[PDB]
């Protein structure tokens, strides 16, 4: 585990796994679609769009592998113990764990599906079925299917229950057999055989809206629907290819949708995991087909990197809405219109994410002090060739940046049916991005529709031009992106050399975009008009400073004076901006080959990542290296700063994150990741860290334990007159407490009644103020004077409140008249002792002032304390001569130096 970052949330991830979602109808108006993240569950609402409602906590230690949703709780079974991992079944409610289930001891199989009905719940794991009494959450018994063949005993498909069938589950086996089991007595009551026995395995099965008609979809291809107590086939459809077996079927239970008029019912949707297209059958006459929604999600292929496939289809109850969840990180819902006869539906909701692991991350800079801050908008460029703006605050306002009407363009082309794919039709994969919202005009960035990447200025200057610049993989252009519109910009800059872009940067002014190819040229473009302004070098020797190799990491100072550039091999060059000429080159040629750079404004610091597996931080002002870090064992994958400038974070290829404290030049954090991290980004306020892993699609967010609680970690690893602390205001109001109470009296007095209540009730800590410290003050002073240390007394007088201090100073007295009893003499001796020790000078002065101000009569009458006053006068005279000479000299010299000209 780590000593700084605790995992907060895997954001950017709505449906990545092969396990299906499940829906539940709340009320008469809303549906909860609950799907699986991989370590928790997400429940979305349907009436409120598809906003998130609950994320489950705590994270289950294994991958989640079966979900269901009963009345309000959600049951989640996790863990495939055939390889190492632990397993269990948990009961969440509102996103918090409220129960666990007792698993059998001898269960060494992953849990495929869960089914709740009656009073029972039923888990079909792999070759055995566990059952639980749900009213008490206890085990009941275990159903063991038997077979003559080891393969044929395996339980593929699953177990579904019919609606009206009491205590009877329907299991499907690996052979074409479907067995009906009474779960209460654990007794096999029937088995039914597949027609035309060339068909092999029951792939899925679903009860129809008709009473006691079950729909069994075989891996040999046929869809059958059968009376499950007559064992007579009602319909038989050659509805599956031998290589494409149907995996999910669902019936529209509304009451219309077929008959080529929309007036008749009987519509069945079906979906095959190897396709991305769903099929709709109208079942009136003989079970004809009526449509195919082509490419409901990404079509799974074995060669491409973009994942695909359809996990589940469920017609929502009594409604034309059909919700489909892809393997490609997407959840869409479609709807059939009524008044035009729509055979295939249209889309009305879509949540989506990246369909491939994330390649680069960038927190958007802070809306200067706005509500967004620097920790709201994350910009993730993903290997499915997409660019998303995730939002850490609400998961429903995360939007894909549009690259033009790409889906309309594909569908007017033929990329949906059967040539290239949609990922190929989008832009190339993003390598690096650099942004600034100094001119992001928000929703009305450029009013009207604008052309996209073309390869008028008053309106642009009035509202605002582009805000994100993006360097892709191997394209000779670097693209621009509007941010306020979440759409692609109107400019795509060449590099000048024709070589592909290598690194792009943008001014803090939001005006200039600097592209740097892998050839060496660094071109500069004004973004508002999209025009070439400056080239580095323009046309030391003026005009000869061009880089010899790839250019990685240019970054422009916020003052628009210098641009600093880092070559791939060799040098780091500071260029003067407006003339466009080289100014100072520092050469690390023979020993390294610099792989990246990051910048810290407000500190003016640069960090170069060097491919001898080291990190060098250099100051841009003095132009010499200031810190070096030697920690890595592989190539530095990604590194960044903290906005405090106290940490520099690096994640290498060794699947280890290191965090270096910069001022003390040490390590602080070094923690191992389960998969090697690909990209890192720290937020522009210090809360969130964002890591895009390798293999995992969607990014991870860590918090900042240090920003919340102080951590003790500093372990480098490898694997004279003085004043007091008393409040100035306290001793000053002790000095002035007559007039402060005089003004704090009200102007008119309160109208206390004639029948004034005598003996107001006791308030405060036992009759006095609650601010006097709880445990006699004259006893304290006198016992100290019997002793020699008044320090207990002086500390007590320090910790007194002001009114009580004036009271316990007025309540001193002469007493009996003996030398060891008179509080005044002992008080003067205490002040004298403090003055000799030189401890609380201002306090002794204030106490002496109030003391002489309200006790001068006794001290002018007596002499036994006038001796102590003489000693006090001597000490006070010496100390005041020294300090007054000091203070007056300093004040006079300072006044003369401020105004010497008169």
């Amino acid at each position: 585990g780590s000593a700084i970052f605790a995992p907060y949330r895997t954001i950017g991830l709505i449906s990545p796994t092969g396990v299906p979602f499940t829906s539940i109808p709340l009320g008469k108006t809303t549906f909860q679609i609950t799907t699986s993240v991989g370590r928790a569950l997400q429940t979305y609402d349907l009436k409120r769009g598809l906003n998130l409602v609950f994320v489950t906590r705590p994270q289950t230690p294994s991958d989640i592998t079966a979900t269901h949703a009963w009345k309000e709780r959600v049951y989640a079974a996790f863990g495939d113990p055939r390889n190492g991992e632990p397993q269990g079944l948990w009961v969440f409610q509102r996103g918090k764990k409220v129960a666990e289930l007792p698993l059998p001891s001898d269960l060494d199989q992953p849990i495929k599906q869960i089914l709740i009905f009656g009073g029972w719940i039923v888990a079909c794991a792999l070759t055995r079925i566990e059952v639980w009494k749900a009213a008490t959450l206890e085990h009941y018994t275990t159903i063991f299917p038997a077979a003559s063949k080891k393969g044929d005993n395996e339980l593929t498909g699953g177990a579904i229950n019919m609606p009206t069938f009491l205590n009877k589950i329907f299991v499907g086996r690996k052979d074409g057999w479907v067995e009906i089991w009474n779960v209460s007595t654990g007794k096999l009551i029937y088995t039914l055989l597949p027609p035309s026995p060339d068909c092999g395995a029951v792939t899925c099965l679903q009860p129809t809206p008709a009473l006691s008609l079950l729909a069994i979809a075989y891996s040999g291809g046929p869809l059958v629907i059968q009376n499950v107590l007559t064992d007579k086939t009602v319909l038989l459809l050659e509805a599956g290819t031998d290589d494409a077996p149907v995996t999910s079927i669902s019936f529209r239970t509304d009451g219309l949708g077929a008959g080529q008029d929309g007036r008749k019912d009987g519509v069945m949707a079906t979906a095959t995991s190897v396709s991305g297209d769903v099929t709709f059958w109208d079942l009136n006459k003989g079970g004809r087909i009526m449509g195919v929604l082509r490419s409901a999600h990404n079509p799974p292929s074995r060669h491409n990197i973009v994942r695909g496939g359809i996990s589940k289809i469920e017609f929502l109850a009594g409604q034309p809405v059909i919700v489909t969840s892809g393997l490609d990180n997407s959840l869409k819902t479609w709807i059939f219109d009524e008044s035009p006869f729509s055979p295939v539906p249209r889309i009305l909701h879509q949540r989506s994410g990246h369909a491939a692991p994330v390649r680069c991350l960038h927190f958007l800079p802070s809306d200067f002090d706005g509500a967004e801050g620097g920790n709201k908008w994350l910009l993730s460029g993903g290997k499915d060739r997409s660019l998303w703006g995730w939002s850490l605050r609400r998961d429903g306002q995360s939007a894909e940046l549009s690259q033009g009407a790409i889906r309309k363009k594909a569908r007017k082309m033929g990329l949906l049916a059967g040539t290239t794919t949609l990922e190929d039709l989008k832009a190339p994969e993003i390598t690096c991005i650099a942004s600034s919202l100094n001119r992001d005009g928000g929703m009305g960035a450029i009013p009207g529709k604008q052309m996209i990447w073309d390869k008028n200025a008053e309106l642009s200057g009035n509202t605002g031009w582009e805000s994100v610049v993006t360097a892709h993989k191997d394209d000779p252009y670097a693209r621009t992106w509007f941010w306020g519109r979440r759409r692609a910009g109107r400019w795509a800059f060449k590099t000048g050399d024709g070589e592909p872009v290598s690194t792009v940067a943008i001014s803090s002014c939001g005006t200039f975009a600097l592209v740097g190819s892998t050839g060496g040229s660094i071109d500069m473009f004004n973004l508002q008009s999209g025009r070439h302004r400056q080239r580095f070098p323009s046309r030391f020797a003026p005009g000869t400073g061009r880089h010899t190799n790839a250019v990685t990491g240019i970054v422009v100072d916020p003052l628009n004076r210098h641009v600093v550039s880092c070559s791939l091999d060799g040098k780091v060059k500071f260029w003067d901006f407006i003339t466009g000429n080289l100014v100072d080159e520092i050469d690390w040629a023979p020993m390294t080959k610099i792989i990246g750079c990051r910048y810290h404004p407000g500190n003016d610091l640069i960090a170069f990542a060097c491919d001898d597996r080291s990190i060098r931080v250099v100051d841009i002002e003095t132009k010499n290296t200031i810190r070096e870090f030697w920690g890595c064992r592989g190539d530095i994958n990604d590194f960044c700063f903290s906005p405090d400038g106290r940490w520099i974070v690096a994640a290498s290829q060794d699947s280890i994150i290191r965090v270096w404290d910069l001022p003390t030049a040490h390590l602080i954090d070094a923690f191992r990741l389960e998969q090697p991290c690909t990209a890192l980004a720290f937020s522009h306020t210090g809360e969130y860290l964002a890591g895009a892993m390798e293999g995992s699609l969607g990014v991870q967010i860590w918090t900042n334990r240090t920003l919340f609680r102080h951590v003790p970690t500093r372990q480098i690893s490898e694997s004279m007159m003085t004043l007091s602390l008393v409040p100035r205001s306290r001793w000053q109001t002790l000095l002035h407490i007559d007039i402060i109470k005089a003004r704090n009296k009200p102007k008119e007095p309160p109208k206390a009644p004639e029948k004034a209540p005598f003996f107001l009730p006791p308030v405060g800590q036992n009759g006095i103020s609650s601010l006097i410290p709880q445990e006699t003050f004259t006893s304290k002073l006198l016992v100290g004077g019997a002793k020699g240390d008044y320090t207990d007394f002086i500390e007590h007088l320090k910790a007194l409140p002001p009114a009580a201090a004036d009271l316990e100073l007025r309540s001193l007295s002469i007493g009996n008249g003996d030398e060891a009893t008179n509080e005044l003499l002992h008080f003067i001796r205490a002040l004298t002792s403090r003055l000799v020790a030189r401890r609380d000078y201002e306090l002794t002065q204030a106490w002496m002032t109030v003391f002489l101000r309200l006790h001068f009569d006794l001290i002018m009458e007596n002499e036994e304390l006038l001796q102590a006053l003489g000693e006090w006068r001597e000490h006070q005279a010496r100390e005041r001569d020294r300090l007054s000479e000091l203070v007056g000299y300093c004040g006079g010299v300072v006044s003369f130096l401020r105004s010497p000209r008169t």
Binding site: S729, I740, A742, R743
Partner: protein, 89 residues
Amino acid sequence: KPKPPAPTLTVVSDVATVAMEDAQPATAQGVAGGETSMIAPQEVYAPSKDTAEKGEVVTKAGIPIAKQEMSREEKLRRRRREKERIRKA
């Protein structure tokens, strides 16, 4: 156009500026701040002819000068200065 000005008088007391302030626990003024009596010495006392003794007169500088101790030439010059003032008005 705001108003024609009208004479408004406001009486001030001898209470300190720490009685002029608003209600707060401890004053923002220091220890020197708190002895300034909100009226000047010019107003707490000013030597003038309406507050001199019987025989003596007070001069322009604020120094009491006795009519007995003045010589004749001093009396003559002071009468001339009074006559010059009265002619000026």
